[PDB]
């Protein structure tokens, strides 16, 4: 991977429009056609799940209207974790509407310095710096009305990386869902001067996490962590939800281990003096 070519498709695909839709019962899409941003609907206002790239604010504001949401009735900001493609408007939304962020322990030091860990020197990695007004660790509960979220530790990809857990309904079925926080290699260092200490560690244990859980509908950061688009153009009044997949997440992390395990093989070798 390269910064450059993250940098390039953050600039043409992740800041393209998509149209916003409620998704399953109280979560709605707002992101774009490359970064998922989720609206949770409660009866005390609005949970926003992350935001995009600094760029991008406006246009995800633009998207939660579209809903006929109301930016101002956001309470809570909750973070999957700490990059500056879902951390680009927090600063602004929160200013904004007063409302409070809330984030894993581990990226508190992330987000209030607005800086890529182990690449700190990095100005195309910065975001506007933001205070985190609760700091959450394994099995914090979070709630707002009518709603409560439940915080997993799921490091890795992030030292705070942080997956979301709650209950909807389908019809009169309770279904679980998963706000998982990523577990791609991306641009992390894994050897050498690892982006954190430990973080081999973390990715191995996120990924038999996640595949212990037991999580109907499979959500992520970014569209392709779940392939939105194919279960968005599926949906029809009457049909079942398409986002409604309980074995996906297995098969998700599965997909990520394997390819953990050849970007691990990959970096170890081109440690090798030359
Ligand atoms: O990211
Ligand atoms: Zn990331
Ligand atoms: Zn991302
Ligand atoms: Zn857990």
Known sequence: ????????????????????????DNIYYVGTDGIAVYVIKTSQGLILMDTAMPQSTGMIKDNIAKLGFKVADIKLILNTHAHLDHTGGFAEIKKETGAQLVAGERDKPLLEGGYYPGDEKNEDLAFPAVKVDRAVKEGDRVTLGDTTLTAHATPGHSPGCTSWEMTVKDGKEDREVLFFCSGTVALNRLVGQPTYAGIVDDYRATFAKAKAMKIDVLLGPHPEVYGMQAKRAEMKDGAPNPFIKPGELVTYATSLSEDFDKQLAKQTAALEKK
Request: zero cysteines; glycine letters at 0%.
């Open 1 to 24: 991977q390269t910064i450059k070519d993250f940098l390039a498709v953050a600039m043409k695909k992740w800041t393209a429009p998509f149209e916003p839709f409620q998704l399953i």
